[PDB]
Amino acid sequence: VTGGMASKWDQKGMDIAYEEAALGYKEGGVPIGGCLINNKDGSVLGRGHNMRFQKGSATLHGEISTLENCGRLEGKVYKDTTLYTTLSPCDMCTGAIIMYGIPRCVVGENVNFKSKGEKYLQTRGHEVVVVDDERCKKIMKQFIDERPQDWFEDI
Amino acid sequence: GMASKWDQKGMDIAYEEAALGYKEGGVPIGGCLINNKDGSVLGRGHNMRFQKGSATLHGEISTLENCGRLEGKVYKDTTLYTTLSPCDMCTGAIIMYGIPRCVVGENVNFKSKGEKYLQTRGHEVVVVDDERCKKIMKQFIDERPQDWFEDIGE
Ligand SMILES: [Zn+2]
Numbered sequence A: 001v002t003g004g005m006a007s008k009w010d011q012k013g014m015d016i017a018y019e020e021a022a023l024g025y026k027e028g029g030v031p032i033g034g035c036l037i038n039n040k041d042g043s044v045l046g047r048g049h050n051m052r053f054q055k056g057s058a059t060l061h062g063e064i065s066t067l068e069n070c071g072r073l074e075g076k077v078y079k080d081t082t083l084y085t086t087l088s089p090c091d092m093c094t095g096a097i098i099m100y101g102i103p104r105c106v107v108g109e110n111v112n113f114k115s116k117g118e119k120y121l122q123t124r125g126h127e128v129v130v131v132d133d134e135r136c137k138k139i140m141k142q143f144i145d146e147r148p149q150d151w152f153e154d155i
Numbered sequence B: 001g002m003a004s005k006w007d008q009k010g011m012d013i014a015y016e017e018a019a020l021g022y023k024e025g026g027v028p029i030g031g032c033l034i035n036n037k038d039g040s041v042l043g044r045g046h047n048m049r050f051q052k053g054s055a056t057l058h059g060e061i062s063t064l065e066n067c068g069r070l071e072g073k074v075y076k077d078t079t080l081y082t083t084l085s086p087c088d089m090c091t092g093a094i095i096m097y098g099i100p101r102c103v104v105g106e107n108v109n110f111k112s113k114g115e116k117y118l119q120t121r122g123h124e125v126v127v128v129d130d131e132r133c134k135k136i137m138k139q140f141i142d143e144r145p146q147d148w149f150e151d152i153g154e
């Protein structure tokens, strides 16, 4: 575990992110999932997965889909949340975290994918905890085993 | 730092999008993406926060969603036109897609660290200081400040 320490809702958050990745996988998309949790009370504001294949979407990464599914929120709500993602965030999803002032991002794995985003979050004073979750590494591997041209065309 | 012949069209369309969004009751921020080689508009969009209850459809994001999935080779010779200087999320989109050039209507009503970050990451940013863009955006912010604050996460 790099980038910080686990906190009390991190098992719940990563479990939901993984469930969303597994749902996306079963739909025929890239298994990338997320959810946004209130750090105070553990409430789930929203959950989502990557909709690139499901909707032919350029922008609906797992983190963007998760934020879309939370709906419109007052800016102050995002300030004590953690965004859970099964996969290290790209520059756009990094940008979402910074723009909304989401203080903390918990990342399943950064072996299959890492951008300059991960470092940039730390440059901008955000917390990025990489938990190296084997369940996230395994489902991404099953997608890449089946659909390497879909994966390497995306990244 | 040479102009593209398509920049007047790009900013005209971006502004059309912003004015349409305003008339629909949304945030007046618009964009389009143009192929630098032949002047093809690949997509166009405006902020859809109020229209769709969307926390992600900033004008720049809407524009890029509207383009559909393009090949990396195509994004690498495009300009993204936006009426307003991009937030950190829309800056991240430009970097992620490899869009080399961003033409900005104005950075007076709004500017993030993204404008300089784009240049740090090797992208060209052009700020036109367009008075049409500054007026419609100031009018929205003056009349609906809480709605503006929601749109920038504040
Ligand atoms: Zn992303």
Ligand SMILES: [Zn+2]
Pocket: B058, B059, B060, B086, B087, B088, B089, B090, B091
């Ligand atoms: Zn934006």
